[model samples]
Target chain A: MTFVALYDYESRTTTDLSFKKGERLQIVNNTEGDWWLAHSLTTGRTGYIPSNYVAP
Target chain B: MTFVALYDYESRTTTDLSFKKGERLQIVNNTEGDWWLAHSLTTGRTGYIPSNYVAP
Candidate 1:
């Protein structure tokens, strides 16, 4: 489903998908845990992220 | 810092991380809370994990 980032999630590593507040994204895949594979509509980058960091 | 997963942590939500016993990882970032950002050297995946799940 489509979601919005609640805060600024800056990347510290190459694997992190950085995003600013109020960015748009969608869950690409839900893993066995809280970190869902996501696609950032703003940056077009995909990475794992904390679900709590975003909301519908 | 390097740490070893002492026990299994099945992630509760899509935000939590999962690991098995005797797994190895390195800390990337520590939050103001219990979960810390970590790199699973074994799986090549980075995500937020519980500090109590691992040890030095």
Candidate 2:
């Protein structure tokens, strides 16, 4: 499934994705709760995202 | 780099790896801090592990 960025975020770590508001993201994994693995369609990159930062 | 488990862990999430003390784990990604992606040789599984749970 995919998600829409709820807000802009510049991740501070290597494993997190940075994106602007309204960027599209594809869900890679979400089993861990709180943090989710996601792909940024806007940047063609994958990283862990804060679950509350995006929405389905 | 490979690491040795510092403590036994029974992960409570789908993306977390459950492991025993002394189990060997191969680091997959470590940039996220606190949580590290790792491959557990003991279970032949790859998942995110709490960084403090293992040591170099």
Candidate 3:
């Protein structure tokens, strides 16, 4: 249902998720690759995140 | 760099990516299957998302 952010990242585009380290996000999709979809628990927004940057 | 959310979904597991309709995400990896790797622009996280749920 939720995941922890492992690293801090800044979004360069409108589709990029901007989060800091140790942030919690709602997990949305887990497909094949290094990225996943998620919703920001703090901002209540949804976007894409890095697989290596977050964990359950 | 970014994609549009075509649908909404809730994650049941830690590996799942949660998202909502009309959300934007960063394109990370586009591979085979109905899923894809993407980054969240709102949360700044990375994870897997459904392919059919988004479009570049």
Candidate 4:
């Protein structure tokens, strides 16, 4: 299958890691939205962001 | 200020980490798009995803 469409709920924004398209983004935190303060899945860093950017 | 709107260029999707609207997302990886294979900042988890989801 191709990369699914992920969306952010709180900020209504999207994550762009440079994938081609229809890529899978494992739900790091769907309930708490704590992934905004941790490191990146593609990169290796940490910071704050909205949780509504990914799919549920 | 509120959380800025971030979008995924690959899937045209958005991220949902539970943050408010117009918030800032520290661009951990804007060059390689390898962040999809790393960890999360809010949840402290690891996964893979697109690189066009976050703002530039």
Candidate 5:
């Protein structure tokens, strides 16, 4: 829903945070404890952070 | 799949052609007869053209 994230430190952080305002992404994987951030489906790039920071 | 499009005149054409190289879009409705170009899920803007212009 929102295009922002908050990291948990043990997983990853937003190094560049390079994303345009109007961009799309697909949920490659967003299950339970297997926590991580979503990636840009078009860019094939990964962003690591807590999943709770995103919307379903 | 390439990001180019082909219009059939009856549907739509590339006017402003505003989209990044790597952008995400959801198939709002890309069935048989109901044709349309993909829209930016993040932007809610629509691109017009034939559905055959894009790849599944």
Candidate 6:
């Protein structure tokens, strides 16, 4: 499934992915707790995003 | 230094930590990109949180 970012997020660490508002991200893993591992369709980068930050 | 959470955050992964709004966290590592390693003063747990979610 695809998720859309609710707000702009800038990565503070190299491990995180940066995204802008309304960006679509491919849901890679949602088995985790409140965070979901996602891949940016636009950037092809993978990272964790807050569950509340994105919506399907 | 310490940072205060601007909103409550629940962990989605086991590797992440849950935090409450206005909670104080000990900044353990800030060398990362948008994410910061922190230890919750209330929960005594360590995990990563978004830099924009907290205030120093």
* Model 2 per-residue lDDT tens digits across residues B1-56: 43444555554544445555555444344443444344444334344443333344
Residue B46 CA error for candidate 3 (Å)?
12
Number of the predicted model whose TM-score against the real structure is largest: 1
lDDT of 6 at A20: 58
Each prediction's whole-model lDDT (CA): 0.44, 0.43, 0.49, 0.35, 0.27, 0.45
Model 1 has an lDDT value of 0.44
- Which ranges in model 5 have alpha carbons more than 4 Å from their true place? A1-34, B1-56
Location of the lowest summed lDDT over 10 successive residues in candidate 5 chain A: A4-13
Tens-digit lDDT string for candidate 1 (A1-56): 44444555555544445555555444333333244444444334343444434444
lDDT by residue (A1-56, candidate 3, tens digit) is: 44455566554444435566656655454443345545555346544444443433
All candidates: DockQ = 0.05, 0.04, 0.09, 0.09, 0.06, 0.04
Clashes per candidate, residues 3 or more apart or on different chains: 7, 0, 26, 71, 0, 13
Per-residue CA lDDT of model 3 for B1-56, tens digit only, reads 44555556564544445766555555334332233345555556575444433433
Ranking the candidates on lDDT from highest down gives 3, 6, 1, 2, 4, 5
Per-residue lDDT over A1-56 for candidate 2, one digit per residue giving the tens place of the 0 to 100 score: 43444555454444445555554444334544444344444334344443333333
Candidate 5: residue pairs that collide: none
Q: Cα RMSD (Å) between model 4 and the true structure? A: 14.2
Error of 3 at A12 (Å): 1.6
So what's the TM-score on candidate 6?
A: 0.29
User: Which residue runs of candidate 6 sit more than 4 Å off their true CA positions?
Assistant: A30-56, B1-56
CA displacement after TM-score superposition, residue A49 of candidate 3 (Å): 14
Model 4 over residues B1-56: C-alpha lDDT tens digits? 12343443122234323333333444343432323332334344344443335332
lDDT, model 4, position A52: 43
